[PDB]
Short mmCIF file of all heavy atoms in Angstrom, two decimals:
data_model
loop_
_atom_site.label_atom_id
_atom_site.label_comp_id
_atom_site.label_asym_id
_atom_site.label_seq_id
_atom_site.Cartn_x
_atom_site.Cartn_y
_atom_site.Cartn_z
N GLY A 483 0.84 -1.19 0.00
CA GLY A 483 0.00 0.00 0.00
C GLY A 483 0.89 1.25 0.00
O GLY A 483 0.50 2.27 0.53
N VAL A 484 2.07 1.13 -0.60
CA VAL A 484 3.08 2.18 -0.62
C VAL A 484 2.95 3.03 -1.89
O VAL A 484 2.78 2.50 -2.96
CB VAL A 484 4.47 1.58 -0.48
CG1 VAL A 484 5.57 2.62 -0.75
CG2 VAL A 484 4.63 0.93 0.93
N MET A 485 3.04 4.35 -1.74
CA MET A 485 3.08 5.27 -2.90
C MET A 485 4.47 5.25 -3.53
O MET A 485 5.47 5.52 -2.85
CB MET A 485 2.73 6.68 -2.41
CG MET A 485 2.77 7.80 -3.51
SD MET A 485 1.59 7.59 -4.87
CE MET A 485 1.41 9.35 -5.39
N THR A 486 4.55 4.90 -4.80
CA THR A 486 5.80 5.01 -5.59
C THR A 486 5.63 6.13 -6.63
O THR A 486 4.86 5.99 -7.57
CB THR A 486 6.17 3.68 -6.27
OG1 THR A 486 6.47 2.73 -5.26
CG2 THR A 486 7.39 3.82 -7.21
N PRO A 487 6.34 7.25 -6.44
CA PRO A 487 6.19 8.34 -7.38
C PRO A 487 6.82 8.06 -8.73
O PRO A 487 7.91 7.53 -8.81
CB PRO A 487 6.87 9.54 -6.72
CG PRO A 487 7.07 9.15 -5.29
CD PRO A 487 7.03 7.65 -5.20
N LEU A 488 6.10 8.43 -9.78
CA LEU A 488 6.63 8.44 -11.15
C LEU A 488 6.95 9.88 -11.60
O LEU A 488 7.96 10.11 -12.24
CB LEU A 488 5.63 7.77 -12.12
CG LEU A 488 5.74 6.25 -12.35
CD1 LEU A 488 7.02 5.90 -13.12
CD2 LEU A 488 5.63 5.47 -11.07
N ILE A 489 6.06 10.84 -11.31
CA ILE A 489 6.33 12.26 -11.56
C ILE A 489 6.15 13.05 -10.29
O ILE A 489 5.04 13.27 -9.83
CB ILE A 489 5.39 12.85 -12.66
CG1 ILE A 489 5.39 11.97 -13.92
CG2 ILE A 489 5.79 14.30 -12.96
CD1 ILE A 489 4.29 12.33 -14.92
N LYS A 490 7.25 13.59 -9.79
CA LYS A 490 7.20 14.44 -8.63
C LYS A 490 6.47 15.75 -8.92
O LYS A 490 6.45 16.23 -10.08
CB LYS A 490 8.62 14.75 -8.19
CG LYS A 490 9.37 13.52 -7.72
CD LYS A 490 10.83 13.87 -7.47
CE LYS A 490 11.67 12.60 -7.14
NZ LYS A 490 13.13 12.95 -7.04
N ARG A 491 5.88 16.32 -7.89
CA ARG A 491 5.16 17.58 -8.07
C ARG A 491 6.12 18.65 -8.58
O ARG A 491 7.31 18.60 -8.33
CB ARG A 491 4.50 18.04 -6.76
CG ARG A 491 5.43 18.23 -5.62
CD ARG A 491 4.74 18.95 -4.43
NE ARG A 491 5.74 19.25 -3.41
CZ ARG A 491 6.18 18.43 -2.44
NH1 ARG A 491 5.68 17.19 -2.23
NH2 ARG A 491 7.14 18.87 -1.62
N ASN A 492 5.58 19.61 -9.30
CA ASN A 492 6.34 20.70 -9.84
C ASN A 492 7.30 20.37 -10.97
O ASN A 492 8.24 21.14 -11.20
CB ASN A 492 7.08 21.48 -8.75
CG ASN A 492 7.33 22.92 -9.18
OD1 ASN A 492 6.46 23.54 -9.81
ND2 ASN A 492 8.54 23.44 -8.90
N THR A 493 7.03 19.30 -11.71
CA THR A 493 7.86 18.91 -12.85
C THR A 493 7.32 19.63 -14.09
O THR A 493 6.12 19.76 -14.24
CB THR A 493 7.87 17.38 -13.06
OG1 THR A 493 8.38 16.74 -11.88
CG2 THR A 493 8.71 16.95 -14.27
N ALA A 494 8.22 20.13 -14.92
CA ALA A 494 7.85 20.83 -16.15
C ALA A 494 7.19 19.83 -17.06
O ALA A 494 7.64 18.68 -17.21
CB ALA A 494 9.09 21.48 -16.86
N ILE A 495 6.07 20.26 -17.64
CA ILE A 495 5.34 19.41 -18.55
C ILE A 495 5.44 20.08 -19.95
O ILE A 495 5.54 21.28 -20.03
CB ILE A 495 3.89 19.19 -18.08
CG1 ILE A 495 3.14 20.51 -17.95
CG2 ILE A 495 3.87 18.52 -16.70
CD1 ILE A 495 1.65 20.32 -17.68
N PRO A 496 5.46 19.30 -21.02
CA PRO A 496 5.24 17.85 -20.98
C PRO A 496 6.45 17.08 -20.43
O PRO A 496 7.56 17.59 -20.40
CB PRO A 496 4.97 17.50 -22.45
CG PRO A 496 5.72 18.55 -23.25
CD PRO A 496 5.82 19.78 -22.37
N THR A 497 6.20 15.87 -19.97
CA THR A 497 7.25 15.03 -19.38
C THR A 497 6.79 13.60 -19.53
O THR A 497 5.58 13.33 -19.68
CB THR A 497 7.52 15.37 -17.86
OG1 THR A 497 8.61 14.58 -17.36
CG2 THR A 497 6.29 15.08 -16.97
N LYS A 498 7.76 12.68 -19.49
CA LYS A 498 7.54 11.27 -19.59
C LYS A 498 8.53 10.58 -18.66
O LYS A 498 9.73 10.85 -18.72
CB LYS A 498 7.77 10.80 -21.03
CG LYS A 498 7.47 9.33 -21.22
CD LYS A 498 7.40 8.95 -22.67
CE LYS A 498 8.35 7.79 -22.99
NZ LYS A 498 8.57 7.69 -24.48
N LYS A 499 8.03 9.75 -17.75
CA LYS A 499 8.87 9.03 -16.81
C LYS A 499 8.45 7.60 -16.80
O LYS A 499 7.26 7.30 -16.92
CB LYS A 499 8.66 9.56 -15.41
CG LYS A 499 8.91 11.05 -15.26
CD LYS A 499 10.35 11.35 -15.20
CE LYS A 499 10.57 12.86 -15.00
NZ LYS A 499 12.03 13.14 -15.24
N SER A 500 9.44 6.73 -16.65
CA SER A 500 9.20 5.28 -16.69
C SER A 500 9.99 4.61 -15.61
O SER A 500 11.07 5.08 -15.24
CB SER A 500 9.66 4.69 -18.05
OG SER A 500 8.76 5.05 -19.07
N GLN A 501 9.46 3.51 -15.10
CA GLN A 501 10.16 2.64 -14.17
C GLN A 501 9.72 1.20 -14.38
O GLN A 501 8.61 0.94 -14.89
CB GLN A 501 9.84 3.00 -12.71
CG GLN A 501 10.52 4.26 -12.15
CD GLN A 501 10.08 4.58 -10.71
OE1 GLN A 501 9.85 3.68 -9.90
NE2 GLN A 501 9.97 5.87 -10.39
N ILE A 502 10.55 0.28 -13.89
CA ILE A 502 10.30 -1.14 -14.08
C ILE A 502 9.87 -1.75 -12.78
O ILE A 502 10.42 -1.45 -11.71
CB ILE A 502 11.52 -1.89 -14.67
CG1 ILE A 502 11.70 -1.50 -16.14
CG2 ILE A 502 11.34 -3.42 -14.59
CD1 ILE A 502 10.72 -2.16 -17.04
N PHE A 503 8.82 -2.57 -12.87
CA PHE A 503 8.23 -3.24 -11.71
C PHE A 503 8.13 -4.72 -12.05
O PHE A 503 8.24 -5.09 -13.23
CB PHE A 503 6.83 -2.67 -11.37
CG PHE A 503 6.86 -1.22 -11.02
CD1 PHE A 503 6.84 -0.24 -12.03
CD2 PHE A 503 6.98 -0.82 -9.69
CE1 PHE A 503 6.96 1.12 -11.72
CE2 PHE A 503 7.09 0.58 -9.36
CZ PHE A 503 7.07 1.53 -10.40
N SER A 504 7.91 -5.55 -11.04
CA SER A 504 7.71 -6.98 -11.25
C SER A 504 6.54 -7.40 -10.43
O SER A 504 5.90 -6.58 -9.77
CB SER A 504 8.91 -7.83 -10.83
OG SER A 504 8.79 -9.12 -11.44
N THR A 505 6.24 -8.69 -10.48
CA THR A 505 5.16 -9.29 -9.70
C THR A 505 5.62 -9.55 -8.30
O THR A 505 6.83 -9.64 -8.06
CB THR A 505 4.76 -10.65 -10.29
OG1 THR A 505 5.92 -11.46 -10.33
CG2 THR A 505 4.17 -10.50 -11.67
N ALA A 506 4.64 -9.75 -7.40
CA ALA A 506 4.85 -9.93 -5.95
C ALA A 506 4.77 -11.33 -5.42
O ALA A 506 5.30 -11.62 -4.35
CB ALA A 506 3.81 -9.08 -5.17
N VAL A 507 4.05 -12.21 -6.12
CA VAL A 507 3.95 -13.59 -5.72
C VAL A 507 4.23 -14.46 -6.97
O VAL A 507 4.09 -14.02 -8.10
CB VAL A 507 2.54 -13.92 -5.16
CG1 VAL A 507 2.20 -13.00 -3.86
CG2 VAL A 507 1.53 -13.76 -6.26
N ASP A 508 4.61 -15.70 -6.75
CA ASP A 508 4.95 -16.60 -7.86
C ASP A 508 3.72 -16.94 -8.70
O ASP A 508 2.61 -17.16 -8.14
CB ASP A 508 5.51 -17.88 -7.29
CG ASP A 508 6.85 -17.70 -6.63
OD1 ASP A 508 7.66 -16.82 -7.02
OD2 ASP A 508 7.08 -18.49 -5.72
N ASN A 509 3.90 -16.98 -10.02
CA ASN A 509 2.85 -17.31 -10.96
C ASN A 509 1.72 -16.31 -11.05
O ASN A 509 0.63 -16.63 -11.48
CB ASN A 509 2.31 -18.71 -10.68
CG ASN A 509 3.39 -19.76 -10.84
OD1 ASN A 509 4.15 -19.70 -11.80
ND2 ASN A 509 3.52 -20.66 -9.86
N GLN A 510 2.02 -15.09 -10.63
CA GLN A 510 1.03 -14.00 -10.63
C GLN A 510 0.60 -13.70 -12.08
O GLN A 510 1.43 -13.33 -12.90
CB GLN A 510 1.60 -12.77 -9.97
CG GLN A 510 0.53 -11.75 -9.54
CD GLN A 510 1.13 -10.58 -8.84
OE1 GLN A 510 1.89 -10.76 -7.86
NE2 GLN A 510 0.82 -9.36 -9.32
N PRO A 511 -0.69 -13.85 -12.37
CA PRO A 511 -1.16 -13.71 -13.73
C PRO A 511 -1.46 -12.30 -14.15
O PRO A 511 -1.55 -12.05 -15.34
CB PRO A 511 -2.42 -14.57 -13.77
CG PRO A 511 -2.95 -14.50 -12.39
CD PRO A 511 -1.75 -14.32 -11.48
N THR A 512 -1.70 -11.39 -13.21
CA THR A 512 -1.99 -9.99 -13.58
C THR A 512 -1.33 -9.05 -12.57
O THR A 512 -1.06 -9.43 -11.43
CB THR A 512 -3.52 -9.71 -13.64
OG1 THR A 512 -3.95 -9.34 -12.34
CG2 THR A 512 -4.38 -10.94 -14.17
N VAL A 513 -1.04 -7.83 -13.00
CA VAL A 513 -0.61 -6.80 -12.07
C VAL A 513 -1.62 -5.65 -12.06
O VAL A 513 -2.14 -5.19 -13.14
CB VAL A 513 0.82 -6.25 -12.33
CG1 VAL A 513 1.83 -7.38 -12.18
CG2 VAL A 513 0.94 -5.57 -13.72
N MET A 514 -1.86 -5.18 -10.84
CA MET A 514 -2.79 -4.08 -10.59
C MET A 514 -2.08 -2.72 -10.67
O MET A 514 -1.08 -2.48 -9.98
CB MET A 514 -3.38 -4.28 -9.20
CG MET A 514 -4.30 -3.15 -8.80
SD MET A 514 -5.70 -3.11 -9.90
CE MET A 514 -6.22 -4.83 -9.57
N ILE A 515 -2.53 -1.86 -11.58
CA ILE A 515 -2.01 -0.52 -11.71
C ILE A 515 -2.99 0.51 -11.12
O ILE A 515 -4.01 0.85 -11.75
CB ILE A 515 -1.70 -0.10 -13.18
CG1 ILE A 515 -0.92 -1.22 -13.93
CG2 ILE A 515 -0.91 1.29 -13.17
CD1 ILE A 515 0.35 -1.65 -13.30
N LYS A 516 -2.67 0.99 -9.92
CA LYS A 516 -3.48 2.02 -9.25
C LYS A 516 -2.71 3.33 -9.29
O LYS A 516 -1.63 3.42 -8.70
CB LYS A 516 -3.75 1.63 -7.81
CG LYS A 516 -4.60 0.32 -7.61
CD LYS A 516 -5.29 0.44 -6.26
CE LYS A 516 -5.03 -0.67 -5.42
NZ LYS A 516 -5.57 -0.27 -4.07
N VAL A 517 -3.28 4.34 -9.95
CA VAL A 517 -2.62 5.61 -10.18
C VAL A 517 -3.13 6.61 -9.14
O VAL A 517 -4.33 6.81 -9.04
CB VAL A 517 -2.86 6.14 -11.63
CG1 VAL A 517 -2.20 7.54 -11.84
CG2 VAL A 517 -2.35 5.10 -12.74
N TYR A 518 -2.22 7.16 -8.36
CA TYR A 518 -2.55 8.03 -7.27
C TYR A 518 -1.89 9.39 -7.49
O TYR A 518 -0.80 9.50 -8.06
CB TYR A 518 -2.02 7.43 -5.92
CG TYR A 518 -2.93 6.37 -5.34
CD1 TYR A 518 -2.72 5.00 -5.60
CD2 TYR A 518 -4.01 6.74 -4.59
CE1 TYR A 518 -3.61 4.03 -5.07
CE2 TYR A 518 -4.92 5.78 -4.07
CZ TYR A 518 -4.68 4.43 -4.30
OH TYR A 518 -5.58 3.52 -3.79
N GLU A 519 -2.54 10.40 -6.92
CA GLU A 519 -2.04 11.73 -6.90
C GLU A 519 -2.00 12.23 -5.45
O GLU A 519 -3.02 12.15 -4.73
CB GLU A 519 -3.05 12.58 -7.72
CG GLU A 519 -2.71 14.01 -7.80
CD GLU A 519 -3.70 14.76 -8.70
OE1 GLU A 519 -4.89 14.74 -8.34
OE2 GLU A 519 -3.28 15.27 -9.76
N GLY A 520 -0.86 12.76 -5.03
CA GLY A 520 -0.75 13.40 -3.74
C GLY A 520 0.61 13.19 -3.11
O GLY A 520 1.49 12.50 -3.70
N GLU A 521 0.80 13.77 -1.93
CA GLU A 521 2.14 13.93 -1.38
C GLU A 521 2.41 13.02 -0.19
O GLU A 521 3.50 13.09 0.38
CB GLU A 521 2.38 15.40 -0.94
CG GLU A 521 2.00 16.43 -2.02
CD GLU A 521 2.52 16.07 -3.39
OE1 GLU A 521 3.71 15.75 -3.52
OE2 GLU A 521 1.75 16.09 -4.35
N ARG A 522 1.46 12.13 0.14
CA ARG A 522 1.62 11.25 1.30
C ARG A 522 2.36 9.96 0.93
O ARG A 522 2.40 9.60 -0.23
CB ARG A 522 0.25 10.92 1.87
CG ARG A 522 -0.46 12.21 2.36
CD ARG A 522 0.17 12.82 3.60
NE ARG A 522 0.18 11.86 4.70
CZ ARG A 522 -0.85 11.59 5.52
NH1 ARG A 522 -1.99 12.25 5.46
NH2 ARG A 522 -0.71 10.66 6.46
N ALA A 523 2.92 9.28 1.92
CA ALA A 523 3.75 8.09 1.72
C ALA A 523 2.96 6.80 1.36
O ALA A 523 3.44 5.99 0.59
CB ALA A 523 4.56 7.84 2.96
N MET A 524 1.76 6.65 1.93
CA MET A 524 0.94 5.47 1.72
C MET A 524 -0.23 5.78 0.78
O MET A 524 -0.86 6.81 0.89
CB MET A 524 0.40 4.96 3.06
CG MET A 524 1.53 4.69 4.10
SD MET A 524 2.76 3.52 3.60
CE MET A 524 1.90 1.89 3.70
N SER A 525 -0.48 4.88 -0.16
CA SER A 525 -1.36 5.20 -1.30
C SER A 525 -2.74 5.54 -0.81
O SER A 525 -3.40 6.44 -1.31
CB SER A 525 -1.40 4.05 -2.29
OG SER A 525 -1.87 2.90 -1.63
N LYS A 526 -3.14 4.93 0.28
CA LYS A 526 -4.46 5.19 0.81
C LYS A 526 -4.69 6.62 1.28
O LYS A 526 -5.84 7.04 1.43
CB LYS A 526 -4.77 4.20 1.92
CG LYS A 526 -4.25 4.57 3.30
CD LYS A 526 -4.57 3.42 4.31
CE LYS A 526 -4.58 3.94 5.71
NZ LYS A 526 -5.74 4.86 5.91
N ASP A 527 -3.62 7.39 1.52
CA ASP A 527 -3.77 8.77 1.94
C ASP A 527 -3.70 9.72 0.78
O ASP A 527 -3.74 10.92 0.96
CB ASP A 527 -2.70 9.11 2.99
CG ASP A 527 -2.88 8.25 4.28
OD1 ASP A 527 -3.91 8.47 4.93
OD2 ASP A 527 -2.09 7.30 4.53
N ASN A 528 -3.55 9.18 -0.42
CA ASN A 528 -3.54 9.99 -1.64
C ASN A 528 -4.85 9.74 -2.41
O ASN A 528 -5.72 8.97 -1.95
CB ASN A 528 -2.32 9.59 -2.47
CG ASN A 528 -1.02 9.97 -1.79
OD1 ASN A 528 -0.88 11.10 -1.37
ND2 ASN A 528 -0.11 9.01 -1.60
N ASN A 529 -5.00 10.39 -3.57
CA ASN A 529 -6.26 10.40 -4.31
C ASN A 529 -6.11 9.45 -5.51
O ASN A 529 -5.22 9.63 -6.33
CB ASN A 529 -6.57 11.86 -4.73
CG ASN A 529 -7.76 11.98 -5.72
OD1 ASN A 529 -7.78 12.86 -6.58
ND2 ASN A 529 -8.71 11.10 -5.60
#
């Protein structure tokens, strides 16, 4: 439930940022992409 930033606030736009992620458990068939906006550390405290 951790926020991982891709674009920090106050970045000049347009912009494009990328990072590489993997799965969390063995044989995981799908990955969940939840996009959040805000300045808190845990995703649940962001929007």
Side-chain angles (χ1 to χ4, degrees):
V484 169
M485 179 62 155
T486 295
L488 270 291
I489 310 169
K490 295 173 187 174
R491 58 169 187 275
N492 206 39
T493 301
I495 59 172
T497 184
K498 183 167 126 196
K499 304 282 182 192
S500 287
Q501 285 177 36
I502 288 283
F503 298 84
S504 198
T505 56
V507 300
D508 292 330
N509 299 316
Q510 198 177 306
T512 87
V513 298
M514 177 63 57
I515 314 303
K516 297 205 234 170
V517 177
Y518 279 94
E519 179 176 61
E521 311 314 311
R522 298 290 302 278
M524 305 302 287
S525 59
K526 84 184 203 68
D527 297 293
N528 293 310
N529 171 213

